[PDB]
Amino acid sequence: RGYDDWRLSDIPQYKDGISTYEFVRATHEADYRTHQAEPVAGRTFGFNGIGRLTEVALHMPTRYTLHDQSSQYKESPSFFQGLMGVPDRGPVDLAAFQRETEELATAFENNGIKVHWVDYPEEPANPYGPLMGHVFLSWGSIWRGGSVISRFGFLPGMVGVSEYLAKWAWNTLNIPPLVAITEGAMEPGACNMIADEVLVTCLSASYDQRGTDQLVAAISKTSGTEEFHNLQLRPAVEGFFNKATGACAHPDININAIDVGKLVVSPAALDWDARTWLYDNNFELIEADPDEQREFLAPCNVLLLEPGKVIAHADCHKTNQKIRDAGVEVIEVTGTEIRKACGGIKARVMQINREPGPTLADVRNRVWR
Amino acid sequence: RGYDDWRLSDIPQYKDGISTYEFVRATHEADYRTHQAEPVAGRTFGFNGIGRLTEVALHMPTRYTLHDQSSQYKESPSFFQGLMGVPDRGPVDLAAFQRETEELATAFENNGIKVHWVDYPEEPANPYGPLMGHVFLSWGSIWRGGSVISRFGFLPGMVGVSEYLAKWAWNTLNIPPLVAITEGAMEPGACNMIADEVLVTCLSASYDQRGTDQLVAAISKTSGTEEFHNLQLRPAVEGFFNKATGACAHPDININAIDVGKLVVSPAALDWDARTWLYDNNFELIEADPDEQREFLAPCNVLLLEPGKVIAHADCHKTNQKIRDAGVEVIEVTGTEIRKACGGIKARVMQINREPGPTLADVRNRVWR
Amino acid sequence: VAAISKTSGTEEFHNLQLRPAVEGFFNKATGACAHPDININAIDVGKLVVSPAALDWDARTWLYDNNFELIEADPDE
Ligand SMILES: [Cl-]
Ligand SMILES: [Cl-]
Ligand code: NA
Ligand code: NA
């Protein structure tokens, strides 16, 4: 479009004979996401919901990606094993880590999903030390309306990182920031949604109420839905993971949607109120295998590609058969080196774009019980 | 600092023998601005308050900066004269516009203030037409805690622009985004503060309550002050400016601080509640000349360099003498071409960094009445 | 308003409250006035004559929503 070819008809609020007041009022009334955020960006974006995922980012690990190679970890492995609480499966193997990363990328390419690659500087550090956990790009997943700077609850190695990923998203994809979390703790990228307007959070080391309130208020205004629901789990865990029980600070280790009104769910996830809400709203529950969960094989850390199809850890054999039994296709992918820190496959994927998908009304209307 | 020289003592929440819970809790309790925003940026920033201004940005105009040269303006001058409502002083003169821009930059250099320069692309456009009003970089002023994407109430030519300036601030100064305004209208950069924790807004074409609530909640959490006050003027004006009265949609045309508890104020600004609040809180009022105000010479659009010293339009002779009479130094600067659109000198300056300055308690404690 | 609403002979009673910028009775710089009857008045059913210095944004919004047509007084008058 030529610079001198623009006319007033190109302004959507403009009408011939409109008064100043009416034009201004029409402007005040416009939807941010569809009038400002997306047109300025020149594209749609956001991972909200359980519709068809189209675009992600991965990080190919280098030696600097390995948490056990930070000088602060070397100084006290037990401090970080306290924070993270995951079972010790030995040192991370760089080459095997790189191979399961390739395998995941191939799974995406084979399912028609665009993969961007995010790199970090050599010797990457923040004001408090080497970066740590920066392979877990879900922490930079993009919401309807824009990107989010997180407040990390337990991992100081992630200070600076949600900034880095959001800056990357702006510079590379033209995706704007929506909000910075500035109180308490809130790690929205580790949350999952179980319908178009239903978010799952936890109260945990990774989320307090103030942080949660701040996030939910921002994303609800750009969600593109009339309602917005937050289901808040209350896991019993001190740091990230409770190796006695399988309980986890992060929703995406606790629960995820596998189809319309079908969820895979940890046995350590659901307090009575959460169970009640899920029952009342007509969600069918597939229970993850208890040993897979407790041993931190991340059987709930599956990635929904679209209703009825997920990527899962290839060695979560029992949970995956239950998922297939519920009529869902499982794409098995190796994810073993990734689990030596605080996440699995879904945790390491930055979700950039997911198409609008089934709603809470759709869940409620499904006849199955 | 070497990558392998980092230790746990470099994490401010870390203490020898700290439990996981206690470390996490300490992390939740940290101040965002001072633990995360500023260290990651590698600097302090924000224009809040009435202390000493140190750093700004200007735009040197090109032909594309001139509002009267947009094809949409050519199509209907009267549509845009409706929105803006400023007196018609003839076509903008590019060369004279460039000269008063140089003069302002020299005033900054002579007063020890760093000036960054912001450029826009050739034929700059947003989804709705040529950019318009993009010389007014105050609209991209930086708050304590970060940058803000605005919701413009009356000028569609500024869609995309607060994004551009915030992106520029991130890429060039490493200053992060704080929040995007996503409802109603809110043009925070056109607001002024009259103490360290006292903001002035309007309800007008440029601000509704929802937009205002969203902004104030975000900036109050990073303000670095125990309290935060919003004085909200209620000007009688349909678009930006009311040429019958001198009333304006923007606070920075209505009022500004010239010293500790001394304000220059338009006669068309103060409703009874605003007047009462200012009286109760011990603010001394210097009234702008009524003709300077009504004719849109922008006598209130002065820029506070520090308490007791302002930059003002050189032809606001009557207001400026009243400011000197109140014991304030006036640095007179030509600002005539700038006033052919919706602002004057303070409006065109992006404020990046102002040092903490006097507080509302300081205002209240000054003995003068 | 509480007293007159009880005897108004109407089911509802509405108060539109203008917020003029004026220190005493009249602001000779602007035309703003402490008194509604210098600011605005009805001239017909849903037609008002209105000062340019009268209407803050909320007042303007209310009048718009309630379908009042506005005739603007001459600014110099
Ligand atoms: Cl109207
Ligand atoms: Cl404890
Ligand atoms: Na917010
Ligand atoms: Na009475």
Ligand 3 center to residue B181 CA distance, Å?
Answer: 8
Contact B131, B159 (CB under 8 A): no
- Distance from C-alpha of B39 to C-alpha of B50, rounded to nearest angstrom: 24
Ligand 4 center to residue C3 CA distance, Å?
Answer: 5
Q: Does A28 touch chain C (CB under 8 A)?
A: no
The per-residue b/e assignment along B2-12, b for 16 or more CB within 10 angstroms, e otherwise, is eeeebebebbe
Other C-beta atoms within 10 Å of A16: how many?
Answer: 8
Nearest 5°: the CA angle A160, A166, A167 is 85
- Distance from C-alpha of A250 to C-alpha of A235, rounded to nearest angstrom: 9
**Chains B and C: how many Cβ contacts under 8 Å?**
68
* Closest listed residue to residue B179, CA positions, set A217, C45, A51: A217
Ligand 3 center to residue B219 CA distance, Å?
Answer: 9
Q: Which protein residues have a CB closer than 5 Å to ligand 3 (ion)?
A: A 179, 218; B 179, 218
3-state SS string for B40-68: HHCCCCECCCCCCEEEEEECCCCHHHCHH
- Distance from C-alpha of A289 to C-alpha of A315, rounded to nearest angstrom: 12
Signed CA dihedral, A326, A328, A329, A331: sign only: negative
Q: Does C64 touch chain A (CB under 8 A)?
A: yes
- A-chain residues within 8 Å CB-CB of B36? 151, 159
Dihedral (Cα; A306, A308, A312, A314), 10-degree rounding: -140
Which helix (H) or strand (E) segment holds residue C64: the answer is helix C57-65
Q: Method used for this model?
A: X-ray
* Closest listed residue to residue A31, CA positions, set B184, B205, B187, B158: B184
Q: Does C29 touch chain B (CB under 8 A)?
A: yes
Neighbours of chain B (3+ CB pairs under 8 A): A, C
Contact A236, A29 (CB under 8 A): no
Residue partners of A171: CB distance under 8 A and separation at least 6: B167, B171
Distance from CA of C4 to the nearest CA of B (A): 24
- Distance from C-alpha of B289 to C-alpha of B283, rounded to nearest angstrom: 19
Ligand 4 center to residue C15 CA distance, Å?
Answer: 17
- Distance from C-alpha of A287 to C-alpha of A268, rounded to nearest angstrom: 10
Distance from CA of A21 to the nearest CA of C (A): 9
- C-chain residues within 8 Å CB-CB of A21? 60, 64
- Distance from C-alpha of B327 to C-alpha of B314, rounded to nearest angstrom: 18
Which helix (H) or strand (E) segment holds residue C36: the answer is helix C36-39
- Report helix angle C57-65 to A20-29, nearest 10: 90
Contact A116, A352 (CB under 8 A): yes
Ligand 1 center to residue C41 CA distance, Å?
Answer: 17
Q: For testing the chain A interface, which of C64, C65, C71 should be mutated: the one with the most A CBs within 10 Å?
A: C64
- Distance from C-alpha of A149 to C-alpha of A139, rounded to nearest angstrom: 9
Ligand 2 center to residue A153 CA distance, Å?
Answer: 15
Q: Do B156 and A1 touch (CB under 8 A)?
A: no
Q: What is the distance of C-alpha B136 from the center of its chain?
A: 10
Other C-beta atoms within 10 Å of B191: how many?
Answer: 25
Dihedral (Cα; A253, A259, A262, A264), 10-degree rounding: -20
- Distance from C-alpha of A330 to C-alpha of A310, rounded to nearest angstrom: 5
Distance from CA of A12 to the nearest CA of C (A): 21
- Copy the structure tokens of residue B369: 């009445």
Distance from CA of A23 to the nearest CA of C (A): 13
CA distances from B72 to A14, A27, B67, B174, B342 (A): 11, 17, 9, 35, 17
Ligand 4 center to residue C8 CA distance, Å?
Answer: 14
Which helix (H) or strand (E) segment holds residue C38: the answer is helix C36-39
The per-residue b/e assignment along B215-227, b for 16 or more CB within 10 angstroms, e otherwise, is bbebbbbbbbbee
Q: Does B34 touch chain A (CB under 8 A)?
A: no
The per-residue b/e assignment along A194-232, b for 16 or more CB within 10 angstroms, e otherwise, is bbbbbbbbbbbbbbbebbbebbbebbbbbbbbeebbebb
Q: Do B153 and A180 touch (CB under 8 A)?
A: no
- Distance from C-alpha of B134 to C-alpha of B74, rounded to nearest angstrom: 18
Contact B264, B300 (CB under 8 A): yes
- Report helix angle B161-173 to A161-173, nearest 10: 130
Q: Does A22 touch chain B (CB under 8 A)?
A: no
What is A10-30 written as a DSSP string?
A: GSTT--TT--HHHHHHHHHHS
3-state SS string for chain B: CCCCCCCHHHCCCCCCCCCHHHHHHHHHHCCHHHHHHHHHHCCCCECCCCCCEEEEEECCCCHHHCHHHCHHHHHCHHHHHHHHCCCCCCCCCHHHHHHHHHHHHHHHHHCCCEEEECCCCCCCEECCEECCCCCCHHHHCCECCEEEECECCCCHHHCCHHHHHHHHHHHHHCCCEEEECCCCCECHHHCEEEECCEEEEECECCECHHHHHHHHHHHHHCCCCCCCEEEEECCCCCCCECCCCCCECCHHHHEEEEECCEEEECCCCCCHHHHHHHHHCCCEEEECCHHHHHCCCCCCCCEEEECCEEEEECCCHHHHHHHHHCCCEEEEECCCCHHHCCCCHHHHCEEEEECCCCCHHHHHHCCCC
Q: Do B40 and A72 touch (CB under 8 A)?
A: no
**φ, ψ for residue A207, nearest 5 deg:** -150, 125
CB-nearest partner of B32 from A13, A21, A182: A182
- Mapped onto helix, strand or coil, the DSSP state of residue A92 is coil
Contact B236, C32 (CB under 8 A): yes
